[PDB]
Write a protein that binds this ligand. Structure first.
Ligand SMILES: Nc1ncnc2c1ncn2[C@@H]1O[C@H](COP(=O)(O)OP(=O)(O)OP(=O)(O)O)[C@@H](O)[C@H]1O
Ligand SMILES: [Mg+2]
Lengths: 73, 238, 213, 243, 96, 241, 233, 48, 234
């Protein structure tokens, strides 16, 4: 919520949830999330951050290899 | 990076990596919700298909006539822990002539998944359970982890993008105690509909519902037994 | 010194109609010369269209019921259906044979509807062999009852008679008679009588009263 | 004891132990095998003799059974452990089934003994390849070839071990039905194939034939020198098609 | 801030990369580049550069002026099977 | 370097590092305090609620190891439930062969000695779990022991375990306790918990309490609901003031 | 608890050496000097006793043990590994004596004790033993002196040294050993060749001597050694 | 961000600085950088 | 650099099992199409010489007279599975006396899929996962069904699957040519068209195996004669 203020975010966003979504994150990674959300809103072609952008930023700034066999649920 | 190759090593920070990881096997699995009332417990699971020509893998596994589970993780491990529970509930019929009460069943899974997180070169079971049972204490839900902990819940969700459900369930946790049976399943679906992408919806070919109640031995619904619950369902607008 | 069996009497009987399966047994559980209890059916419903009748040493009836009633569930989880009568009969044979060197002491009469929708009855010995029959009695009065079914249901040693199938009405009143006639001459038959009719609509149970002597 | 996992999957999707055992075959000796209609000839190149060794203990063509013989190329040590278990199997089968082993069946058991060793704890793979050769209960000829993996195919002709890629290139063009029409033409096909990968003439090729319902004869060195004279005689009467 | 993984290409990629390197050399009419990609397992982009070189080589070694369908299957055999004996990708792939 | 990959490796310093780390996994758990008085023992766990989704008062950290022996744990909870079964199993083999409730001095030395066997080999991992055994008898009084990962047991008059181990040991040193009836202690325990807890590092908490002493006739229960409320009211008042 | 390792720790190196045995022989060469001298009617086993204060009680341990009525040991190297081999030897001797009713010959006992030490260079999860045993014995009319090495080998000697400065002592013995000695020097000459490697003053409680004649092996009482230490006997 | 710095400041964000390329040898970590090296048309300073 | 056989990737799934999947992409191609008329299994032999007998290659094996199978991957590792399948189906016939549902057999084979374990087992357990994917096609009381079973133990029913070194390519051409209303003669002809593109050599009567399993028949492998007749039509 401290690095969002610089930009336009919808009232949709729910910081309570995102915080619980991330884990083991540093101040440096939380910072990076907002950076990445804004970067996903730049590609999509909008000017607001929705709750969905932050969700895909977390997936991005979170270290995660390209595991395309994750279909054994 | 050397503290990740066994369950046997602790990390300087005071964790164990191999147990942390195993739990990422659960977040790869397919969303699933579980909530209760005071007369019914319900397991609503979002099945998944890995192709266009292919059926969907079963998320809800029948255990006994008052216990269901919903897996999420390696399926080969989920049927290794399901055969052990089926075997624990046939041990109780056969010795005590009663149903094994769920609280004492989840305590055996707890004793058997603890073991291989402390022996060399064995791994944790890469599967998380939701255990919906009903005995002489009303309904229960139990979430099991690969760490070997477990919890008594009033309404839990695991799998992928489960966090989106957990919030929906945490705003409505007050309303659940007063629902009739059909009203409850509506909640579960509306919670499970928040775990999808925004582009698709719940159909009859990728939803699985499991109901256990006071007078109703645990059943499972698929395909066209699920239609009496999607029909009537609210529309989810963006 | 120690004798691991005792003979607890009990008489079991079963007729396979053409869309119905009777399985009927007295309830007197007796040991030696005392009468332990007067009610204790020898009939356990297994599926929705399968009754089994155990009679003999009552310590083994209880075990052999819980074993079948378990390997019945176990089967259902792996195959996602219930077992047919035709299968239980085969399975029970193996179980029995598993203990070929300290055997069960249980005479088993399975009766239910196989797949087509017809009466089927299977008769076991103690060590586990079975054929399919149209009626078998077993147990203590097995030698009282077997000739009155060979005659009424089998028409054996008769001539110039009809052979119109067995009516659900002529069966039950047939059973009720042969048991009233075995309670006169056999000392292990009496008190009550569970008749289990097994149609395609479930399983009814009818209770009739025999002589308590 | 010593419960370790020797063979695990690569990340590339191989098994490096069963691929390394493939090299212990390539450092072996050439052996070929052609099947006729009444005769099957497998020859192993190099007796390995140094004018001091006996030719009775360096043999690489053993006989599992009476209608079944086997040549190998790899680690002589391992091969003797397989051959033994094979000979046991060949008698265990005469006890329980009256007929003698067929040649498929004693192979499927040599292969299945080698596959289990690349998927059990403690063990390295068997580092041998094999030509199992024989006649069935119907006089039919058969030629099977195994390898460390524990797979097996039949062949019409085949070579294993060192220099086997070259010898397979010679048998593609020369194995027809203008050859192997007689017992004399089938032995000459094998020798003519090992002469391409032996650098010391014919006095270095041990060669064993099996003939229909009779037992394995190893051709003494005199008969092989006679056949090598007919080969070299035939490359000077190909000078009637160059003139 | 952003970590980009360069995993080994898949089937679809390979097919693409053969076109990027072979289009420049003379090839007979009908080369199944999609079959040279089924025929590659998990290959580096730089393994496929090498294949195309050798398909060119056999054409040069034999004095023909055009690489054929055979020349690839042969040069794809040489460069992958043999040389894969001592590849980086197997071992170096866990540190990745 | 390579002195932490095994429990079977002393370091040059002189100390097994794998046991050190285990003990630090305890320090990152919520706090549990024990305090023995002259006619009973009272237990206190600072159980955090991490969501509103977990059912209330469930998945406890207060086991019954025997019909007169509490066990309050801290640290990695999975390994705790494992010990609580090894202990039940010992305190059954002891009633079997010797025919009388096992004495807590011995049940402790036997559960420590079992934890210790797990710091010797490389084939196993030392338990991440410190825990207190309380007990009351009329032939031995109250006794309170505390075990840890090392495999050490020590008699105590009070102690604490977990992330506020330091702040809570103060509150008990500033407390007379060899003179108070059981009934008066429970008020103290609640008050101590409330002090040592941070709601600026955690959300909220549920206060778990256990008798075992003269009140209950040598059994071990959980404090009845009414007395638990009274101890929470008297604890908010000492934070107001 | 555990299972145990299964894989040998003694392994060949590119040289063709078993590095572990090479090292365990260097432990042997740190140990207290020991000499052995076959006489012509007895064997003498003398050894530099260990101590490093006046607090130790120099009669509570013994570096010269009896294995049988007709056998003896001293050792050079690690003291714990010596109590293990002395104890597997005494049992070997008792199985042999239980089957043949006859005291185990000394050639036999060394050949078996050696095969125990050979088992620990090819067993799972162990290190070789850290000692060299010098086994005397007097059977069948003769005396015998052997020496087994942590390798497992064993060599009959007519006189030898082990432990610290065992290259200086094998030379010193090479000259001073002329067969047909009486039993009483081997003692004298033995004690001398301990002195060629010992710094300080020898006393009756500072070395240990054991003889081994037809009458049977026996440790020499402290009094007895004090007399041979007239440096003239 | 170097060709069109106007669209990142109008939204009100700040694009990210560094980028780590990693992969098995010979998968275009350098190639993909030889690429950006010329097309970028902005000062390019590579250290080995 | 070495780890266990049972290590989780920090990503989230088992190192070995993720690897054993790659061993499939080296194997031949198999295509199974499920119809109302029956199941067909088509798998290319992939002979490597002209000297090999194109007949001692078996990549379709009978499990019982109503449950076919097709292997792709390391055909050596299938030998252990196939034989457990048979002895499974027979034991189920020796006790319950009746055929076995196709699904149940594939479940009983998949319980071995995760069973390696360097230690804490027998001196006889597997050390490494199986390197092989299967296509059990059979006909029982649910009519025809076709299951796909990979080295992860995850089996699932398919209407039409392709595996092997043309899983990607063929799977996409099945989605365009499959539909509920087929007969068995349409499918056998449909698959061999897909199987003719993804092979490397020309499609002979010696380069495939066909099998079918139909309600009114047994498992029935097509011989070299009958194959000539359906390649004539293409
Ligand atoms: N995706 C690709 N497209 C086209 N060519 C590629 C690709 N990947 C690799 N190559 C080829 O591989 C060659 C070398 O690749 P490059 O050197 O960039 O790999 P790298 O990641 O830098 O490896 P290294 O770690 O050895 O430096 C290039 O010249 C190029 O032809
Ligand atoms: Mg580079």
């Amino acid at each position: 919520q401290i690095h969002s203020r610089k930009m336009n975010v919808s009232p949709d966003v729910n910081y309570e949830e995102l915080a619980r979504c991330t884990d083991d994150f540093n101040g440096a990674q939380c910072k990076a999330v907002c950076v990445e959300a804004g970067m996903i809103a730049l590609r999509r072609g909008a000017t607001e951050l929705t709750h969905e952008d932050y969700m895909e930023g977390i997936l991005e700034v979170q270290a995660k290899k390209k595991a395309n066999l994750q279909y054994y649920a | 990076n050397q503290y990740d190759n066994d369950v046997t090593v602790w990390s300087p920070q005071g964790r164990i990596h191999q147990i942390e990881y195993a739990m990422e096997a659960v977040k790869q699995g397919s969303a699933t919700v579980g909530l209760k009332s005071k007369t019914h417990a319900v397991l609503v699971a979002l099945k998944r298909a890995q192709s266009e020509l292919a059926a969907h893998q079963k998320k809800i596994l029948h255990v006994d006539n008052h216990i269901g589970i919903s897996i999420a993780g390696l399926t080969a491990d989920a049927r290794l822990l399901c055969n052990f529970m089926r075997q624990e509930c046939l041990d109780s019929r056969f010795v005590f002539d009663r149903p094994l009460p769920v609280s004492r069943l989840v305590s055996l899974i707890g004793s058997k998944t603890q073991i291989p997180t402390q022996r060399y070169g064995r791994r944790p079971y890469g599967v998380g359970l939701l255990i919906a049972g009903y005995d002489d204490m009303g309904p229960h839900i139990f979430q099991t982890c690969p760490s070997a902990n477990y919890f008594d819940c009033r309404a839990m969700s695991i799998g992928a993008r489960s966090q989106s459900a957990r919030t929906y369930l945490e705003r409505h946790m007050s309303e659940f105690m007063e629902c009739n049976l059909n009203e409850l399943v509506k909640h579960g679906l509306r919670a499970l509909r928040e775990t999808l992408p925004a582009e698709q919806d719940l159909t009859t070919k990728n939803v699985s519902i499991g109901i256990v109640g006071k007078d109703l031995e645990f059943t499972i619904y698929d395909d066209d037994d699920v239609s009496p619950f999607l029909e009537g369902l609210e529309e989810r607008p963006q | 010194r120690f004798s691991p069996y005792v003979f607890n009497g009990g008489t079991i009987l079963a007729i396979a109609g053409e869309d119905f399966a009777i399985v009927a047994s007295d309830t007197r559980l007796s040991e030696g010369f005392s009468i332990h209890t007067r009610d204790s059916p020898k009939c356990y419903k297994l599926t929705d269209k399968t009754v089994i009748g155990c009679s003999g040493f009552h310590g083994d009836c209880l075990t052999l019921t819980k074993i079948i009633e378990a390997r019945l569930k176990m089967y259902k989880h792996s195959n996602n259906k219930a077992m047919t009568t035709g299968a239980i009969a085969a399975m029970l044979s193996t179980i029995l044979y598993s203990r070929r060197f300290f055997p069960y002491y249980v005479y088993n009469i399975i009766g239910g509807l196989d797949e087509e929708g017809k009466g089927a009855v299977y008769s076991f010995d103690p060590v586990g062999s079975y054929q399919r029959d149209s009626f078998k009695a077993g147990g203590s009065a097995s030698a009282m009852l077997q000739p009155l079914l060979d005659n009424q249901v089998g028409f054996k040693n008769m001539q110039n008679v009809e052979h119109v199938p067995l009516s659900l009405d002529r069966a039950m009143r047939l059973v009720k008679d042969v048991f009233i006639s075995a309670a006169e001459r056999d000392v292990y038959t009496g008190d009550a009588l569970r008749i289990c009719i097994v149609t395609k609509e479930g399983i009814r149970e009818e209770t009739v009263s025999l002589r308590k002597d | 004891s010593y419960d370790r996992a020797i063979t695990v999957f690569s990340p590339d999707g191989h098994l490096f132990q069963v691929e390394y055992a493939q090299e212990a075959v390539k450092k072996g000796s050439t052996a070929v095998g052609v099947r006729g209609r009444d005769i099957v000839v497998l020859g192993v190149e190099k007796k390995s003799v140094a004018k001091l060794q006996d030719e009775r203990t360096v043999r690489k063509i053993c006989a599992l059974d009476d209608n079944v013989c086997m040549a190998f190329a790899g680690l002589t040590a391992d091969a003797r452990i397989v051959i033994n278990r094979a000979r046991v199997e060949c008698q265990s089968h005469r006890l329980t089934v009256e007929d003698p082993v067929t040649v498929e069946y004693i192979t499927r058991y040599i292969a299945s003994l080698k596959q289990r060793y690349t998927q059990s704890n403690g063990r390295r793979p068997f580092g041998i390849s094999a030509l199992i050769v024989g006649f069935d209960f119907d006089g039919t000829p058969r030629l099977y070839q195994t390898d460390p993996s524990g797979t097996y195919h039949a062949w019409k002709a085949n070579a294993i071990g060192r220099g086997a890629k070259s010898v397979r290139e010679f048998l593609e063009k020369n194995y027809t039905d203008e050859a192997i029409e007689t017992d004399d033409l089938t032995i000459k096909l094998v020798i003519k194939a090992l002469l391409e990968v032996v650098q010391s003439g014919g006095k270095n090729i041990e060669l064993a034939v099996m003939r229909r319902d009779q037992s394995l004869k190893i051709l003494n060195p005199e008969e092989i020198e006679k056949y090598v004279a007919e080969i070299e005689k035939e490359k000077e009467e190909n000078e009637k098609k160059k003139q | 801030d952003r970590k980009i993984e360069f995993s080994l290409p898949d089937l679809e990629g390979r097919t693409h990369i053969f076109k990027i390197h072979a289009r420049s050399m003379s090839v007979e009419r009908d080369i199944r580049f999609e079959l040279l990609a089924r025929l590659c397992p998990n290959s580096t982009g730089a393994e496929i550069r090498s294949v195309c070189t050798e398909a060119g080589m056999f054409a040069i070694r034999a004095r023909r002026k055009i690489a054929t369908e055979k020349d690839f299957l042969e040069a794809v055999n040489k460069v992958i099977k043999s040389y894969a004996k001592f590849s980086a990708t197997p071992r170096y792939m866990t540190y990745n | 370097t390579g002195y932490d990959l095994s429990a079977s490796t002393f370091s040059p310093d002189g100390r097994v590092f794998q046991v050190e780390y285990a003990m630090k996994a305890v320090e990152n758990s919520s706090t549990a305090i024990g305090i023995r008085c002259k006619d009973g023992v009272v237990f206190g766990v600072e159980k955090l609620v991490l969501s509103k989704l977990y059912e209330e008062g469930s998945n406890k950290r207060l086991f019954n190891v025997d019909r007169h022996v509490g066990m309050a744990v801290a640290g990695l909870l999975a390994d705790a439930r494992s010990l609580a079964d090894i202990a039940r199993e010992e305190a059954s083999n002891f009633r079997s062969n010797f025919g009388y409730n096992i004495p807590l001095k011995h049940l402790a030395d036997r559960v420590a000695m079992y934890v210790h066997a797990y710091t010797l080999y490389s084939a196993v991992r030392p338990f991440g779990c410190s825990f207190m055994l309380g007990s009351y008898s009329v032939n031995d009084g109250a006794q309170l022991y505390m075990i840890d990962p090392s495999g050490v047991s020590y008699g105590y008059w009070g102690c604490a375990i977990g992330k506020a181990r330091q702040a809570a040991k103060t509150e008990i040193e500033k407390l007379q306790m060899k003179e108070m009836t059981c009934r008066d202690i429970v008020k103290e325990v609640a008050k101590i918990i409330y002090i040592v807890h941070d709601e600026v590092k955690d959300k909220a908490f549920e206060l778990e309490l256990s008798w075992v002493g003269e009140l209950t006739n040598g059994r071990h229960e959980i404090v009845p609901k009414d007395i638990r409320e009274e101890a929470e009211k008297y604890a908010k008042e000492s934070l107001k003031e | 608890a555990e299972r145990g390792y299964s894989f040998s720790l003694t392994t060949f190196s590119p040289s063709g050496k078993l590095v572990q045995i090479e090292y365990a022989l260097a432990a042997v060469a740190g140990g207290a000097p020991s000499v052995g001298i076959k006489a012509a009617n007895g064997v003498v086993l003398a050894t530099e006793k260990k101590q490093k204060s006046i607090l130790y009680d120099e009669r509570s341990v013994h570096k010269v043990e009896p294995i049988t009525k007709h056998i003896g040991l001293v050792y050079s190297g690690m003291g714990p590994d010596y109590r293990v081999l002395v104890h597997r030897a005494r049992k070997l001797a008792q199985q042999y004596y239980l089957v043949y009713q006859e005291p185990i010959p000394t050639a036999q006992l060394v050949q078996r004790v050696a095969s125990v030490m050979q088992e620990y260079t090819q067993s799972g999860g162990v290190r070789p033993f850290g000692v060299s045993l010098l086994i005397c014995g007097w059977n069948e009319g003769r005396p015998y002196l052997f020496q087994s090495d942590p390798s497992g080998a064993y060599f009959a000697w007519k006189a030898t040294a082990m432990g610290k400065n065992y290259v200086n002592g094998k030379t010193f013995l090479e000259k001073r050993y002329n067969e047909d000695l009486e039993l009483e020097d081997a003692i004298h000459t033995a004690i001398l060749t301990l002195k060629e490697s010992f710094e300080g003053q020898m006393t009756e409680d500072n070395i240990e001597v054991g003889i081994c004649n037809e009458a049977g092996f026996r440790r020499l009482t402290p009094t007895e050694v004090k007399d041979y230490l007239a440096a003239i006997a | 961000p170097l060709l069109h710095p106007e669209r990142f400041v109008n939204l009100g964000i700040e694009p990210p600085k560094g980028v780590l390329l990693f992969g098995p040898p010979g998968t275009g970590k350098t190639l993909c950088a030889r690429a950006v090296a010329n097309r970028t048309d902005a000062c390019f300073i590579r250290v080995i | 650099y070495d780890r266990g056989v049972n290590t989780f990737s920090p990503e989230g799934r088992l190192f070995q099992v993720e690897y054993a999947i790659e061993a499939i992409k080296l194997g031949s191609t198999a295509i199974g199409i499920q119809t109302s008329e029956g199941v067909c299994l088509a798998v290319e032999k992939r002979i490597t010489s002209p000297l090999m007998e194109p007949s001692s290659i078996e990549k379709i094996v009978e499990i019982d007279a109503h449950i076919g199978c097709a292997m792709s991957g390391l055909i050596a590792d299938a030998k252990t599975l196939i034989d457990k399948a048979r002895v499974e189906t027979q034991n189920h016939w020796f006790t319950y006396n009746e055929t076995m549902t196709v699904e149940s057999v594939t479940q009983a084979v998949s319980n071995l899929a995760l069973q390696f374990g360097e230690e804490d087992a027998d001196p006889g357990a597997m050390s490494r996962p199986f390197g092989v994917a299967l296509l059990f096609g059979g006909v029982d009381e649910k009519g025809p069904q076709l299951f796909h079973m990979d080295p992860s133990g995850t089996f699932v029913q398919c209407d039409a699957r392709a595996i092997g070194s043309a899983s990607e390519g063929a799977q996409s051409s099945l989605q365009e040519v499959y539909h509920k209303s087929m007969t068995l003669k349409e499918a056998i002809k449909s698959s061999l068209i897909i199987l003719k593109q993804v092979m490397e050599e020309k499609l002979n009567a010696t380069n495939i195996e066909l099998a079918t399993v139909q309600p009114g028949q047994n498992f029935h492998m097509f011989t070299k004669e009958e194959l000539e007749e359906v390649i004539k039509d293409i």
